[PDB]
């Protein structure tokens, strides 16, 4: 949501995952990006829709998008003897979903 000084009210700003909706979603550098953002993505993908209630905007947007996350192994090299969760610097719930 973007505050719009010209119109003088808070206005919706295009969520890139809404842009993902109806089409394929490319995801890159995800293993290095912010964890709270990761949880937000979890929430959004769980329902295939994004629900936002802030700044007086209580809208909810459908997010129908086939997503593909790109990740690098811990140190860039996966160790087959190592468990995947140990080879993964990210959360367990995300790999589950």
């Amino acid at each position: 949501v973007r505050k719009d000084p010209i119109t003088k009210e808070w206005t919706l700003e295009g969520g890139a995952l809404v842009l993902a909706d109806k089409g394929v979603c490319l995801i890159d550098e995800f293993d290095k990006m912010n964890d709270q953002d990761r949880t937000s993505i979890h929430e959004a993908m769980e329902q295939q829709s994004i629900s936002i209630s802030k700044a007086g905007i209580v809208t909810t947007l459908q997010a129908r998008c086939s997503i593909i996350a790109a990740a690098n192994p811990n140190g860039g090299r996966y160790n087959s003897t190592l468990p995947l969760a140990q080879n993964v610097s990210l959360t367990e719930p995300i790999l589950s979903r």
């Binding site: 842009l19 979890h42 929430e43 769980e46 329902q47 936002i52 209630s53 802030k54 700044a55 979903r97």
Partner: protein, 243 residues
């Protein structure tokens, strides 16, 4: 514009309307209506362009949901009679239990607890200044991928007196009720948060653990008091939270 229409990539356009004394206040915001009114144009105060709006000749509910139930029995004596018959037959309790959460494959006592919570605990007002707290809030802990969020969404769909939300989706400040600056008044007005809407309704919210804890502390007090007491920004408004 027609949330089902979902114009891809188009921000939903909105038009202004007017209602007459026997049309006004029929329906609330956030509710879909099938309208029949003349297309209307007036000058806002850009050449030869004027404000588009509608003067309504008839109002019909697209959501089709009845208005605020003023205890007038549209179900009438008949439907409530079979309702009591279902209450008369104890087996119907397990019927409601099983019916909730389709395809869940069991968890029947869980569904019983859900039905009881949705059913609403009775708020008793003592002759003393005290008052027995009626509603309760159920806590959902467990392993992921176990239809928990799915069940929450289903339950909220069952009972729209409250609104399904998520922790991150809900603004951290003023979860119960956010304070916002009005465009035409520099004073930060009280905007109704989720538990304002959830007040009078059984509410399901997602990602409690993922939510920041500090404001969730402000939630337990509000549910405990069954109200929402705010003295922030020099504004001492207190709003009920029956959720």
């Amino acid at each position: 514009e027609i949330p089902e229409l979902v114009p891809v990539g188009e921000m939903p356009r909105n038009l202004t309307m007017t209602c007459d004394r026997y049309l006004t206040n029929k329906v609330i915001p956030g509710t879909r209506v099938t309208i029949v009114g003349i297309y209307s144009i007036y000058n806002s105060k850009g050449v030869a362009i004027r404000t588009p709006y509608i003067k309504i000749l008839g109002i019909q509910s697209d959501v089709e949901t009845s208005s605020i139930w003023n205890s007038v029995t549209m179900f009438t004596e008949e439907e409530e009679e079979e309702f009591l018959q279902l209450s008369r037959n104890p087996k119907l309790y397990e019927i409601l239990t099983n019916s909730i959460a389709p395809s869940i494959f069991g968890n029947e006592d869980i569904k019983k607890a859900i039905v009881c919570l949705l059913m609403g605990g009775s708020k008793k007002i003592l002759p003393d200044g005290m008052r027995l707290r009626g509603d309760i809030n159920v806590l959902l802990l467990g392993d992921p991928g176990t239809a928990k969020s799915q069940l929450l969404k289903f339950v909220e769909k069952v009972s729209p007196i409250a609104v399904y939300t998520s922790g991150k989706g809900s603004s951290a400040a003023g979860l119960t009720a956010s304070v916002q600056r009005d465009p035409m008044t520099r004073e930060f007005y009280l905007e109704g948060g989720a538990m304002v809407l959830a007040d009078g309704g059984v509410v399901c919210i997602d990602e409690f653990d993922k939510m920041r804890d500090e404001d969730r502390v402000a939630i337990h007090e509000a549910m405990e008091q069954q109200t929402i007491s705010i003295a922030k920004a020099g504004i001492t408004t207190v709003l009920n939270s029956r959720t």
